[PDB]
Design an enzyme around this catalytic site. Structure first.
Site, PDB file in Angstrom:
ATOM      1  N   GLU A 179      -0.056  -2.181  -9.767  1.00 33.39           N
ATOM      2  CA  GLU A 179      -0.232  -3.303  -8.857  1.00 33.39           C
ATOM      3  C   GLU A 179       0.893  -4.282  -9.038  1.00 33.39           C
ATOM      4  O   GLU A 179       1.293  -4.966  -8.081  1.00 33.39           O
ATOM      5  CB  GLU A 179      -1.567  -4.004  -9.085  1.00 33.39           C
ATOM      6  CG  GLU A 179      -2.769  -3.127  -8.766  1.00 33.39           C
ATOM      7  CD  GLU A 179      -2.910  -2.772  -7.294  1.00 33.39           C
ATOM      8  OE1 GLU A 179      -2.265  -3.389  -6.402  1.00 33.39           O
ATOM      9  OE2 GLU A 179      -3.707  -1.854  -7.025  1.00 33.39           O
ATOM     10  N   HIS A 195       2.518   2.068  -3.560  1.00 34.45           N
ATOM     11  CA  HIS A 195       1.442   2.560  -4.392  1.00 34.45           C
ATOM     12  C   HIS A 195       1.317   4.080  -4.284  1.00 34.45           C
ATOM     13  O   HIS A 195       0.753   4.731  -5.175  1.00 34.45           O
ATOM     14  CB  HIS A 195       0.135   1.954  -3.893  1.00 34.45           C
ATOM     15  CG  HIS A 195      -0.357   0.782  -4.684  1.00 34.45           C
ATOM     16  ND1 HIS A 195      -0.645   0.855  -6.034  1.00 34.45           N
ATOM     17  CD2 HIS A 195      -0.702  -0.472  -4.291  1.00 34.45           C
ATOM     18  CE1 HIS A 195      -1.096  -0.321  -6.446  1.00 34.45           C
ATOM     19  NE2 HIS A 195      -1.150  -1.139  -5.404  1.00 34.45           N
ATOM     20  N   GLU A 245       0.816  -1.213   0.000  1.00 37.87           N
ATOM     21  CA  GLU A 245       0.000   0.000   0.000  1.00 37.87           C
ATOM     22  C   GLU A 245       0.854   1.268   0.000  1.00 37.87           C
ATOM     23  O   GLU A 245       0.441   2.277  -0.555  1.00 37.87           O
ATOM     24  CB  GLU A 245      -1.060   0.013   1.133  1.00 37.87           C
ATOM     25  CG  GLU A 245      -2.033  -1.167   1.214  1.00 37.87           C
ATOM     26  CD  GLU A 245      -2.782  -1.438  -0.074  1.00 37.87           C
ATOM     27  OE1 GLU A 245      -3.389  -0.503  -0.639  1.00 37.87           O
ATOM     28  OE2 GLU A 245      -2.777  -2.609  -0.528  1.00 37.87           O
TER      29      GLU A 245
HETATM   30 ZN   LIG Z   1      -2.588  -2.621  -4.771  1.00 36.59          ZN
END
Ligand SMILES: [Zn+2]
Ligand SMILES: *[C@@H]1O[C@H](CO)[C@@H](O[C@@H]2O[C@H](CO)[C@@H](O)[C@H](O)[C@H]2NC(C)=O)[C@H](O)[C@H]1NC(C)=O
Ligand SMILES: *[C@@H]1O[C@H](CO)[C@@H](O)[C@H](O)[C@H]1NC(C)=O
Ligand SMILES: *[C@@H]1O[C@H](CO)[C@@H](O)[C@H](O)[C@H]1NC(C)=O
Ligand SMILES: *[C@@H]1O[C@H](CO)[C@@H](O)[C@H](O)[C@H]1NC(C)=O
Ligand SMILES: *[C@@H]1O[C@H](CO)[C@@H](O)[C@H](O)[C@H]1NC(C)=O
Ligand SMILES: *[C@@H]1O[C@H](CO)[C@@H](O)[C@H](O)[C@H]1NC(C)=O
Ligand SMILES: *[C@@H]1O[C@H](CO)[C@@H](O)[C@H](O)[C@H]1NC(C)=O
Ligand SMILES: *[C@@H]1O[C@H](CO)[C@@H](O)[C@H](O)[C@H]1NC(C)=O
Ligand SMILES: *[C@@H]1O[C@H](CO)[C@@H](O)[C@H](O)[C@H]1NC(C)=O
Ligand SMILES: *[C@@H]1O[C@H](CO)[C@@H](O)[C@H](O)[C@H]1NC(C)=O
Ligand SMILES: *[C@@H]1O[C@H](CO)[C@@H](O)[C@H](O)[C@H]1NC(C)=O
Ligand SMILES: *[C@@H]1O[C@H](CO)[C@@H](O)[C@H](O)[C@H]1NC(C)=O
Ligand SMILES: *[C@@H]1O[C@H](CO)[C@@H](O)[C@H](O)[C@H]1NC(C)=O
Ligand SMILES: *[C@@H]1O[C@H](CO)[C@@H](O)[C@H](O)[C@H]1NC(C)=O
Ligand SMILES: *[C@@H]1O[C@H](CO)[C@@H](O)[C@H](O)[C@H]1NC(C)=O
Ligand SMILES: *[C@@H]1O[C@H](CO)[C@@H](O)[C@H](O)[C@H]1NC(C)=O
Ligand SMILES: N[C@@H](CCCC[NH3+])C(=O)O
Ligand SMILES: N[C@@H](CCCC[NH3+])C(=O)O
Ligand SMILES: [Zn+2]
Lengths: 860, 849
Positions: free
Chosen positions: A328, A309, A306
């Site tokens: 991702e 990202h 997270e």
């Molecule tokens: Zn993700």
């Protein structure tokens, strides 16, 4: 009325700049009131402003020029694409700016998508409330009218009127909480950085914080009062990683605060909102004693993912959803990268290597599709959320990071982000950044595109004749037609020469064939060092033997990665048929000297898969012979296991593996030791601590007696550790009382003693072992409409169920039955990937037996 | 190029005498043949057409000149072409010399091997001709219509006791060492009852009235044929008294053939049986054993008159003798073997027929047989039992004395000849004096499928009566003999012949309750208007002994049947049975236990475990006292100890009160004694069942089954092993038995049946049938009684549309034949009927079990 837009995408004509959003959410009444002020800018001349809204009761709509006089505009509706169009009474001219004001009422979501809400039961028996958001992909337009595409980046002023007892949060830090005359608080939060509509966030809940400042930025974990003691590790870790990513990316986290929140609900939306990182309470909680090894790895990973990202996704967004796998993929890579740098001690490369094995398996099927596809409607948008893509990306970046330097990768990354900050990107742009740091010595774009545009991966074949290494490439397809398949493959290789003359190099195979000139004659050769390349390698008979013989003499000349790799590949190649199952069992006879967890787990995975396939047919002697054989190779390492939690994470994982195997099949000491441990635990009323590494094993052996099963069920409903509950449930579902198994499934579908979220896990578990094999699939069949009501046809749960319940079939009869059943539903259910994957798998299973089964008797 | 193209032979030539000379080798399965058929033409014909299959014709002579043979194997015929024209009225002698192989499939002239008590490979050979297997052993006119006389002579070894129909005339030791036995000229008889057995046997003979009765068992097992003899003696007397026609032959042999796959047939003077079906021990065999042996002897004896003396012309009328043998089976027993209470079995069997005959899958018993395979179809207990049932209706409708006279006449009027079903009815016409048609009456029964639903309404001194088809889901009219019974304590009873869709009966008094169909002697299920049910329902509560056990159990059955077809709500069925606290008769208690188990098992399979467990706790709460009173012995009358097994097996199955523990206590002792300490045979299965629930008991029992000598005990052990809740052992049983490993492939169907009646093995049994289909089909051919039983046992508890779809789909993917098969369409029907049962009755149950 007529709608001025007949397209899924919004026109380039008008462009948002600022967003002032005020909201009044009433959590007890689960409705809200909202006011959006959208400052746009026209670019082409237009008489309509088309943007996104859903489920909005529009009270008033007002248009502006500068003239501070708000002019009443008319609003059109088109629910199909979740669009509204604003008819302006003045044409909008290029360059000219305008401001739109919209007032509306809406419901807080019953589901857990959009602006969702729920109620929980506090440690005080006191029922509480909570609201949060989850907009990815197309759910911000539910919360507030806006331009809901990633490319339309704007700034955001977020203001919520909450209640004094609640802590209200959002993306940016809180500018001003100003008491209102009635007992209500109008919270305001600073104007946001140029950002995507799906990353906007807000939470209203009764919460505590645990906080720390790192350089300028104040990181804070928010948890529910009764569980704030369990988010210690979380913060500790978010500190280490934020440090790392900032150091790696060389662009500083652009906000003054970073919040992570452990939402108290299992169905809760977990994602990477800028500054407001959401998580399921479950996935952030950690106790430095009472928690598992997999528990540490899991939360350490999710924080990393997270966080990564924040830069890859929020700062540098993808223009459209067709490039999601890139962000991702990157997050999923840094997930394991950052962890090798900081948490070397975790050995997360072991997990990454498994993930990759598991991905390749699913990718090699005909059902697989390339990661880089054309995405049109909301279904194809929601289709882009699958780990296969995420993990294939992950794999492709490791292959790129290992080919170019470690340092070259970084500098491309650093250049990539810097150059494109606060902008929307296309997949290629990343490759272009890679292109320039290589001084145009490679293309990378050309190279990567062979991987991204084609399904599956190549099978590299290798032949050594003297000092000449002959390479061949071909699509790894499992029998069951084209030749456009050609991948630009970074082949690494490792060798041992004139007595322990260790050598290694790398070369690009951009053609269907080639040859590497070896510096000298070699005893053996291993391609794909550490399986850093997303391919399978097959060897000529004598080259396989050169490796099979080496492992027997000294396997430690190779890494645990390579050794695991060989174990994977030979078994996969036996499946295809390019090698007899014999050779497969031949290669693994070296295991007596294997002390590293990775190869031992893979051997165990392969052999448990074969065992179960044979078990399910009547071939129970073969199945038993198989397990005694494998046990013999690992007898020592098994007999060396202490039933504790001591050692490195790696060797802790080896204990859980070796002890489970041995107990499952009741070999030697295992059963008796776990049973003594179980009895003692039961006898303590479950108040005695069991070592996390041996918990599931102990619980299973327990559940084999009504008394055990019953006590476990008892503890499942009483205790409060969810992770201990899952391990408890596994044991219950591992019973051989067909009736009990049935009950467990029935109960979870009725949400009775186990919640419906657990259903797939129950079906997976029941279906795997013999007494519940046919049961699990029958339950799926007869309860199909109730399942599909409770998990939508296309959710991951229903895919999980169909796979779990059918993957172990290996007869034409079952193939017939399975197909029949979906044909008997509709044609739309029978066309689903998961149904076609299912039947492809049963065929591959049938083909496996009619290739390897008869010869089996004569060995093992 | 062949003259005769038809299934049934020409009428023109006709046999008289048979000179059958056989030299069969037992070690090698082959034989040398010689037949001399003395015939007579009734028309002037140019060729003799008869039957012959699997024969190498050495010399074929006609008298003294050789004649040219022709063959049409498709019809199983051969043609002999005559030098002269065979002129009408003239006798001729046809003589064939041939070679052939001794059969292995236990059809025709067959043989086998077995190991001695001393463990030696002894041999044996025998015959099964009915219907169409004489053709294979010897050429002849292989039809029942063509009776003749048989002189058989078989060359045997010194150690073998070769047997045949007629007693042995002579035995001449040939110069080879071989012995040639000759048997007397036979009575005028059909080719399909000709038999001969060569094997090392001992005898147990006992004269009765010149005719010598003998039981032929293998040496080691001669000790168990004592009951057998005793019984044949008693029964022979009876039938000679009843039929009033003396048993013709000077001898009567009942041979106990040493194989489990042997053919059992009523061959004149030489009655064949499976070893197991005659062996009895007065100490160690149960009541069902004792009934089984008694029943079968009687069945085959009744045949010596019904089907041997008086034969049927063609195969279609088989049901008649087969029904008669089946009725006489139960009559003979009710008169002489009265204590066995076998009427309970006849009733039960009647009920189960009724259930199979109530399906759209049903066929009328009087169909036409023309097809080579249509002949094989006539072999099914549904035709035999229906026949039986309606013979019973007739006996009870007319006098027991009137019935007899009609029999005695028919047998006399038709001795040594070939009849048709009508001829029995004709023989009834005169004893009724053409008062009652009978012939037209019985034809309404035999020519249309199913049976009637007599609906009944009572108003004052009159009862209204309508009839209709009994269909569960068209105009059928039966000639129904309605016996009835009513009640200050006025026990009145009467009959009434109803030949119209609607009727009315006049009553002498206004009555409390009426009960139509006394002791269910009539093949019809009776429904009542609402208050008439309640009248009976009240009476059963007040005093049930005003009705017979037979009546009582009839009500139990009828209400539950009706409840499925929805003419009655299931609640009312359960309401009726609430009197069961007061029931001490086994007939009713079993029928209720049966009915409730079916519901229980249907429910349990669908996952409604509570509902299923409430159901058994209810039924238990009714039978609580009875269960608790019972002793763990064999002490009691046959009917009462039949009840012991029932009650104890119910109570143990569902782990109710006292039982599990008491049965486990008797297990633990018996096991400790290494299986020597006696167990009462009435608790045996229930004891083993409870034991087999542990890996200890299970493994011991297994060790016993592979090791112990008693098949009767073995069958009780296997039922327990297959009652295990561990799917691994269950799978294994079916697996082992298919490969014939520790359990013969004969027992398979029984294992699959047992496995798929319980929850752990329900999906497992059917799965095993699907996955071993091809393999099952080799061992037992399509249309086999075993493969029918297998497809039934494993599919009959599927009660969902998904299952029904799957089951169908499966067979469709096999063949159009496989899919359009009697048992395959039957199975599917039963599933829909379960489905229909649920949608009618499942939703309500929650509120009242
Ligand atoms: Zn993700
Ligand atoms: C056809 O053959 C049978 C014998 O095979 C003859 O029947 C015998 O006839 C004599 C008198 O001629 C009787 O005493 C015997 O009792 C008869 N025996 C049997 C077994 O029936 C018959 O006469 C022959 N017919 C012709 C026309 O020659
Ligand atoms: C919110 O819920 C109400 C329930 O009556 C429903 O009628 C309505 O459609 C929802 N409001 C909006 C604006 O969609
Ligand atoms: C207004 O438009 C001009 C460009 O035409 C732009 O430079 C300026 O920033 C805009 N101002 C606002 C408040 O949107
Ligand atoms: C929501 O409404 C309830 C009941 O009207 C009230 O007690 C509460 O204070 C309100 N809270 C907010 C945040 O508006
Ligand atoms: C199998 O793969 C080929 C592409 O190589 C494709 O054309 C075909 O549609 C696929 N079939 C299925 C059932 O996935
Ligand atoms: C391998 O060696 C040959 C000369 O034997 C040469 O022609 C070729 O270019 C070499 N390949 C590489 C990759 O250096
Ligand atoms: C495993 O064993 C070998 C020698 O038996 C040794 O060289 C190797 O270092 C061991 N592995 C580890 C991680 O210590
Ligand atoms: C076991 O422990 C829990 C408290 O964690 C308690 O609720 C339960 O009643 C205990 N049972 C006994 C028998 O002490
Ligand atoms: C006997 O059997 C053999 C095959 O074993 C067969 O070829 C032959 O036709 C048979 N012989 C006779 C005389 O029926
Ligand atoms: C059967 O054949 C064997 C030799 O093949 C012989 O010893 C035995 O006596 C024969 N019996 C007869 C009745 O021919
Ligand atoms: C067997 O039969 C003969 C007459 O054929 C008889 O004398 C003898 O008693 C019989 N044996 C027994 C044990 O009944
Ligand atoms: C015994 O046989 C003679 C004929 O030989 C017969 O007349 C008599 O009725 C028979 N007696 C009995 C009691 O069966
Ligand atoms: C005897 O049989 C014939 C039919 O063959 C029948 O018509 C006749 O009525 C019968 N007579 C007696 C007295 O049974
Ligand atoms: C019944 O009695 C009535 C007179 O009460 C009479 O008319 C009728 O014929 C009788 N019905 C029958 C079936 O005998
Ligand atoms: C059953 O009980 C009744 C009295 O309730 C009695 O007349 C009858 O003889 C009993 N029958 C048996 C077999 O015990
Ligand atoms: C039990 O008795 C049987 C014979 O009845 C014998 O064969 C077997 O060996 C005995 N079992 C043991 C353990 O001695
Ligand atoms: N990509 C987010 C999850 C978003 C959930 C989308 N429904 C993390 O990982
Ligand atoms: N009809 C006989 C059975 C014949 C068996 C034919 N395969 C009775 O018993
Ligand atoms: Zn019979």
């Amino acid at each position: 009325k007529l709608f001025p837009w007949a397209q899924i995408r919004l026109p380039t004509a008008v462009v948002p700049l600022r967003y002032e959003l005020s909201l009044h959410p009433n959590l007890t009444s689960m409705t809200f009131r909202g006011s959006v002020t959208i400052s746009v800018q026209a670019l082409q001349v237009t008489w309509n402003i088309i943007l996104h809204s859903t489920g909005h009761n529009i009270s008033r709509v007002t248009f502006m020029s500068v003239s501070s006089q708000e002019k009443q505009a008319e609003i059109l509706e088109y629910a199909y694409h979740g669009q509204i169009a604003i008819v302006a009474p003045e044409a909008l001219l290029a360059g000219h700016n305008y401001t739109l004001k919209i007032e509306y009422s809406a419901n807080i979501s019953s589901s857990y998508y959009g602006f969702y809400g729920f109620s929980y039961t506090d440690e005080s028996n006191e029922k509480k409330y909570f609201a949060a958001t989850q907009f990815e992909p197309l759910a911000a337009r539910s919360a507030f009218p806006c331009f809901d595409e990633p490319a339309f980046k704007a700034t955001f002023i977020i203001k919520i009127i909450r209640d004094e007892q609640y802590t209200a949060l959002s993306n940016m830090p809180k500018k001003s909480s100003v008491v209102l005359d009635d007992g209500l608080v109008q919270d305001e939060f600073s104007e946001s950085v140029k950002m995507s509509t799906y990353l906007v966030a807000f939470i209203v809940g009764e919460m505590k914080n645990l906080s720390q400042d790192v350089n300028g930025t104040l990181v804070s974990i928010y948890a529910v009062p009764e569980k704030i003691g369990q988010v210690h590790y979380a913060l500790e870790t978010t500190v280490k990683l934020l440090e790392f990513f900032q150091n790696y990316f060389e662009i500083q986290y652009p906000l003054k605060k970073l919040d992570l929140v452990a939402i108290p609900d299992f169905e809760a939306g977990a994602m990477e909102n800028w500054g407001l990182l959401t998580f399921r309470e479950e996935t952030l909680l950690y106790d430095s004693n009472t928690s598992s090894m997999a528990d540490r790895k899991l939360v350490t990973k999710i924080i990393a993912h997270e966080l990564a990202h924040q830069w890859f996704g929020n700062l540098v967004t993808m223009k459209w959803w067709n490039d999601l796998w890139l962000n991702e993929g990157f997050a999923t890579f840094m997930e394991y990268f950052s962890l090798e740098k900081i948490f070397k001690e975790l050995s997360s490369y072991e997990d990454f290597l498994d993930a990759r094995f598991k991905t390749m398996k699913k990718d090699s099927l005909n059902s697989s599709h390339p990661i880089s596809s054309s995405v049109q409607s909301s279904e194809q948008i929601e289709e882009m959320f699958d780990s296969l893509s995420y993990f294939k990306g992950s794999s492709l970046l490791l292959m790129l990071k290992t080919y170019l330097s470690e340092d070259v990768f970084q500098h491309a990354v650093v250049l990539y982000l810097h150059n494109h900050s606060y902008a929307s990107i296309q997949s290629d742009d990343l490759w272009d950044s890679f292109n320039e740091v290589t001084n145009q010595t490679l293309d990378v774009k050309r190279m990567m595109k062979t991987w991204t545009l084609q399904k599956g991966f190549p099978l590299v074949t290798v032949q050594k004749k003297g000092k000449e290494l002959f390479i061949q490439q071909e699509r790894f397809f499992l029998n069951m037609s084209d030749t456009s398949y050609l991948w630009h493959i970074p082949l690494s290789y490792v060798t041992e020469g004139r007595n322990y003359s260790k050598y290694q190099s790398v070369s690009l195979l951009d053609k269907k064939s080639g040859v590497i000139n070896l510096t000298e004659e070699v005893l053996w050769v291993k391609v794909n060092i550490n399986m850093n390349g997303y391919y399978i390698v097959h060897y000529a008979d004598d080259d396989w033997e050169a490796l099979i013989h080496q492992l027997k003499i000294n396997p430690y000349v190779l890494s645990d990665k390579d050794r695991a790799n060989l174990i994977n590949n030979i078994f996969e190649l036996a499946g295809l048929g390019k090698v007899p199952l014999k050779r497969a069992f031949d290669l693994i006879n070296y295991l007596g000297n294997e002390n590293h967890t990775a190869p031992i787990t893979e051997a165990l995975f392969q052999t448990d898969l074969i065992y179960n396939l044979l078990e399910k047919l009547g071939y129970m002697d073969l199945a038993s012979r198989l397990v005694t054989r494998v046990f013999k190779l690992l007898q020592n390492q098994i007999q060396q296991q202490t039933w504790t939690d001591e050692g490195t994470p790696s060797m802790r994982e080896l204990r859980s593996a070796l002890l489970e195997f041995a107990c499952t099949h009741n070999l030697g000491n295992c059963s008796t030791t776990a049973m003594k441990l179980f009895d003692d635990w039961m006898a303590s009323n479950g108040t005695q601590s069991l070592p996390t590494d041996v918990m599931t094993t102990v619980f299973k052996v327990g559940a084999k007696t009504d008394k055990g099963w019953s006590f476990l069920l008892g503890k499942y409903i009483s205790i409060g550790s969810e992770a201990e509950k899952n391990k408890i449930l596994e044991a219950l579902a591992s019973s051989e009382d067909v009736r009990k198994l049935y009950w467990l499934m029935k109960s979870s579908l009725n949400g009775d003693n186990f919640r419906t979220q657990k259903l797939s896990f129950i079906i997976r578990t029941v279906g795997r072992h013999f007494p519940g094999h046919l049961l699990a699939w029958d339950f799926v069949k007869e309860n199909w409409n109730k399942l599909v009501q409770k998990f939508p046809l296309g959710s991951y749960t229903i895919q999980n169920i169909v796979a779990g319940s059918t993957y172990l079939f290996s007869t034409k009869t079952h193939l017939s039955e399975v197909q029949a059943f979906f044909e008997n539903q509709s044609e739309a259910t029978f066309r689903l990937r998961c149904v076609q994957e299912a039947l492809e798998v049963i065929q591959l299973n049938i083909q496996w037996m009619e290739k390897n089964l008869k010869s089996l008797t004569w060995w093992l």
